[PDB]
Symmetry: D2
Subunit: 457 residues, 4 copies
């Protein structure tokens, strides 16, 4: 239970407070979503694709205002908030172009073309979204959910209600029908009420493991399907034969993007003994050179963290790790001042029993662990209760492919930079959740896959 309050993390100053939605408001959101769905499900998929293009255009028309809102409410460097808007608008256009074909009926092996599989919409999808990508997280799911013919009803993180209001205004400007996209500032009880309401067909959650478990349990009890995209503690494996400098550049970007607040950030660096010291020296130097400060200044790489309590939790994780024997090579301190800044941090000599190896470090703290050889590296990578994405750097192409097949995660990047992309599946295993987003997966997760069979006699 958090507070419905926006505070600028760079200044510590209050932005706005918003009361939780009352009973009439929750009922109005549900009623409007259902009536919106009733009409939207009857449109042509090509009309829905056009609506996606219109949303993309409205977003681009308000791009700077949107980016400024993201930075103001949650501290993301403005260069990255702008890139978030660019990516989110590109996603609308990508699904408008490629999505409709993914909804074509499928032929079957039943003789004489008598049976097909149709992809029908389910209904209203309740979405519970976090603050780390206030726009991208929303559209990553909403774009294919809408294209499939569903309505989308959003509960956004209570620290980004300004962003949520703005998203709603932009989507309405684009001509999105009333109720097809909407949002409500529900508290926990309000979310439970909605999950249990027959107007909600299914639920999608992006956030913490605890949030995912709480909601997944309620959805299961109500016989409603979920997609849960939860935290990660992604391993980033570097073998002796890697292109060392490229590995370091990808490692630094992977860990420190969005001030480390990324579910699929590179969090556990597992480096083969031969190259470990060279990697560590270079990684530390690059991390120490990262600029941190006012996120309104385009050249700062690191902003403040979004939430004061979350900075306190991360500091405790660093404290615990040092107490357990980790070596602090850089940072490990809250920065004095009224903002919510935490120093770029590196912990080395991290072993599997330590906090920095076992928990998700959701901020600018890298953990470095030395592996005996590639087999040890793989074992260390899989020794985690999370399983979102992973990276492997090695010149041995055959070995990398073999390791990919044995990594217990939903995405593996070989000799490159991990990211989410419309063209490929996103999502993990174990406590990172289940279900997939993007490509045709995100589109079909919220379809009623319907067999239609004529003259079965």
């Amino acid at each position: 239970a958090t507070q419905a309050l926006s505070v600028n993390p760079a200044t510590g100053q209050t932005l706005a407070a918003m009361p939780w939605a009352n009973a009439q408001e929750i009922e109005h959101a549900l009623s409007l979503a259902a009536s919106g769905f009733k009409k939207w499900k009857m449109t042509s998929v090509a009309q829905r694709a056009q609506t996606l293009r219109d949303i993309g255009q409205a977003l681009r028309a308000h791009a700077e205002e949107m980016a400024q809102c993201i930075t103001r409410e949650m501290g993301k460097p403005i260069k990255q908030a702008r890139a978030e808007v660019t990516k989110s608008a590109a996603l609308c256009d990508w699904y408008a172009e490629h999505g409709p074909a993914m909804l074509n009926p499928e032929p079957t092996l039943v003789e004489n073309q008598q049976a097909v599989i149709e992809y029908r919409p389910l209904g209203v999808i309740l979405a519970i979204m976090p603050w780390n990508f206030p726009l991208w997280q929303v559209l990553r799911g909403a774009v294919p959910i809408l294209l499939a013919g569903n309505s989308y009803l959003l509960k956004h993180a209570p620290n980004v209600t300004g962003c949520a209001q703005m998203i709603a205004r932009i989507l309405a400007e684009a001509g999105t029908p009333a109720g097809v996209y909407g949002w409500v500032n529900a508290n926990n009880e309000g979310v439970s009420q909605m999950i249990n309401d027959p107007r909600i067909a299914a639920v999608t959650v992006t956030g913490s493991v605890r949030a995912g478990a709480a909601i997944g349990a309620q959805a299961g009890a109500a016989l409603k399907k979920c997609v849960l995209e939860l935290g990660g503690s992604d391993p980033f494996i570097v073998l002796n034969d890697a292109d060392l400098e490229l590995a370091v550049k990808a490692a630094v970007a992977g860990r420190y993007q969005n001030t480390g607040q990324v579910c699929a950030a590179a969090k556990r660096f597992i480096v083969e003994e031969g190259i470990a010291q060279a990697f560590t020296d270079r990684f530390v130097a690059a991390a120490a050179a990262l600029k941190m400060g006012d996120p309104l200044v385009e050249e700062n790489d690191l902003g403040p963290m979004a939430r004061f309590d979350l900075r306190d939790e991360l500091h405790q994780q660093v404290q615990a790790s040092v107490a357990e024997g980790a070596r602090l090579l850089l940072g490990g301190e809250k920065i004095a001042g009224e903002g919510n800044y935490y120093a770029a941090t590196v912990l080395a000599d991290v072993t599997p029993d330590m906090t920095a190896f076992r928990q998700e470090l959701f901020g600018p703290v890298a953990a470095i662990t030395v592996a005996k050889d590639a087999a040890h590296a793989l074992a260390l990578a899989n020794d985690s209760e999370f399983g979102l994405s992973a990276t492997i750097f090695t010149a041995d192409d055959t070995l990398a492919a073999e390791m990919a097949a044995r990594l217990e995660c939903g995405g593996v990047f070989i000799n490159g930079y991990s990211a989410s992309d419309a063209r490929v599946a996103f999502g993990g295993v174990k406590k990172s959740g289940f279900g997939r987003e993007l490509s045709h997966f995100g589109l079909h997760e919220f379809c009623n896959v319907q067999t239609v069979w004529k003259n079965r006699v």
Copy 2:
């Protein structure tokens, strides 16, 4: 866990619940079995499927007899269940491997692919109505994907469960790859919460699905829930009446009514209502009921005594609410568990026969004023598994199919599950899909592999 022959009322066997050591052994074996099985080739696994089909065929009569003995199904139907289950093994052996091929993506120059990786041990909770087919409908694709399968079967069919395990071991299914455990609800909970269980699959009642779904969700594990249905069977004025009646009777009465996707709610347009009703009642009255070892019998006893009590109460309530009893609606005297073939007419949407799943030989008939009213009636349900529509108008049938809130729509034919098409529903009928490539992919770790992203 007691087995009682429903045809005679006599005890067959009692099997104690698995203890803590037995639960631990089942999980340990499943996990070690998976560790080896996940490393096998798809060709080796497809060969195992063929070996399973062969072993089933070699013990086909013994299997059928066991099914009938424990849960009452007419023997001809038990034999058909074995036949369909063995064919499923061969269908997946042939068509399954290609479903596991890596997928190209739109990323340029073949730099990214999607792979379908094994997930781990899948825990299955299965019911007694198709003790073999419900198990294999899921287990065949689950095993082909490289997972292990660990089954908790219905307590009244443990004899069937033992026999299934016996046959799969004979076929050479590695230890732990297929296994089963006679766990009580506490044991099921313990396994769902164990890290060695990767995901869960449930076929059963809404209450069971909700309880298990809640536990799986809390443990961050995905489910597929294939729960009850109250399938609408719509007959419009221009229907082929003789085929509609045949399909209606087969739809409602197969397996003595105990089918999740049975035709349960007959929604008939005014014009044809009386003619349909008269023919339906006559056909239902002509069905023969008795000893399920006697091949002339179309209907056996119901599987469970308490479920017959419950069904009878649903009939009594429907009658008290105003439904017209046209046939049956009585328990049959004797020590067996027989319930008369039953027809309720003048059923309105507020009634028990319309709102609840009637899991036994009881048809509900409701008159629709027009096609729009028929559609509204069909969709006025908390369930959404499958539906049937009979009309001579191809265009109208397709238009209505697009508006039916269920996972399967059969136009002018007999509904059924088939390996070639998706099976599963919406609303309280659950979520997720079985069969075709759907049942294979539900329990895969869909993994993006992208090289050189710079």
Copy 3:
């Protein structure tokens, strides 16, 4: 469960009642809250007079009430009349003895500066079973009302005729609107009410499954509950027992209400020396009990209340015999339209068997032989339940020693177990928690409030 009344003697439908809708649930809650708002301000004297008026109104409708109980759930008519008599007497007992229980308590704080006050809590939601449709309701409602609370009842779906009649009786007695009320809520309606701030606390009498489901909801809502659940009461007979009295008490204890009593004597644990003698006398007495139409006063046993429960009971008997129990009498459903099960005795019952580990809620006795008094105690305590217990022995000191070591909430020494307004009722382990009757049932639903002046 279906919202349907069926006469278990005849198998025929009595009535069907639809579940309460949203408006009806809201009305029940609103009425209970407005009722409590006025009732909490009344004097204890005024409330005690209402209890007397309820007693009078019950007596005025005694035969109609008894007939309704028998009709809906099958209880022999003499036993239904006794349930009405006991319920009316409870009203008078609390009217006389209850008020003093609500007096403020002095404390050891010096100079009378602090007292403890027993204030009403609010609306108490009650979920009650079909086995004593009147007594289980009033057992709780009487003290709950006297304390200044409202009582809102969800009754078992097979006894809604009884529920309706109780409501008309309490209205005739002049019980204010909302102070006593009931609603035919389904499971989703009960959950809704538990989670509504107008419900202050919950009381449940019934099955372990129901108690666990409701207890979880009440805990989650931060609301206190009293759970009075099933039992598998041991009835211990030692070599030196007054055998005549033990057999009479054993038969009455097991077979009252056709065995459908939470605190029934269910597990007979008999010392090796007297086992055969007890068994012979008990089997002969059980065989002599008359079964049939419960409107016929001479019948000792009626049909069981629910068809599904007779089937479950038969399966428990079937499993017990499969496990090795010796069937000494009965063990069969009676042919016909009614829901009759023969009076049954299972012997050679060992701790691993169904008859020993599960609650047998019907006319089935289980007899287990104990090597000595120590083994008897161990067997008695080898159960997931712990409601009440009986010990028959002439050894005064040993009986008291055993009572102290029995894991149950009630122990009867050389007598017949029963609930009584003068003593606590309730158990431990899976039998639940909390206590009904005497001052316990009254204080369970009070806000115990310290009031302390001039603490400086």
Copy 4:
């Protein structure tokens, strides 16, 4: 995880791994074997053990108070007072407790039926960090006297205190398993609640923890006592002794740097005296000394948890955004420690964060009441109901209002506190069940009717 950090300095004290499966099993096994023996002891023997615990705690009094202050920031003067109160509780129950376990006569004729208070079994306890010793002993003392075992899961930021309490109770000769503790994580707590060796559960803590645990206990058919947060109203009417009301108000709000479930949190003051009360209260609060809690004269320490200071500041920020007037404080103190300024919010109306949520730190909320009827309505307009205070010269009115206040304790013209001699606990979201006096002793008894010769 379990990490101790000194809130005055921000520096790490110790980390402690969570109990593993073998450790949890050992804790439950030892508690059960301990109970099996302890339930057979005489009450006189158990009473002597209580006296011995009091003696051992007084022998290590300064070490214990120092540990309390070091781990959670309480001013040392108050940590010492906590030790004094806890040891006094041991002696109080040793003296007055045994008689509470005497069998009760009943109205059944000829003395044939009595009520006995039997031990129930192992009681699982989940305790918070605000009174690391007192919260434990408040329940453990009567639970042990009743013949039960006590198995503790303490707050993860005070495991040093937990280890020290266990050493002291072992030095006193408390049998193995009769008192014990385990550093269990949430999964371990769930495991224990569902284990048959645990008979019942007691929780003192947050509303969220109470609800999570109460749900698990209810599902397991186990009784709870839940002593959760409060937002206690403190009503001051026009005819009050103003200076005494102000002193009691300041003490009630600011004790333990405001981290008390039964703190005075919502000041509801009649319009006639509102401004005078406000001026005096603000002056006294501003004069409180805040700083190093090792300095015997400081009145306020740092708050115990960094995340909780952040949450509290957000509650202040939201209240001000909603229209509350900041009269004092409302800022985190710069530095490495966890200090928050003594704060006063005025013009607080019932729709505001400061009125509707528990403010667990040094933040007073002042609301003006039109008259005594309005004051009572404001007091009762809360989801909480732990205790309350009323200041007025009208004794009859005070008594009338007490009867209508929806809380478990009412203090008239005085200072609220817990005390062994009276019941403690509340209603609504403050939980249910009562501690102390005979209430805390009987909550975890098997109340057993023993009836001879019933016909």
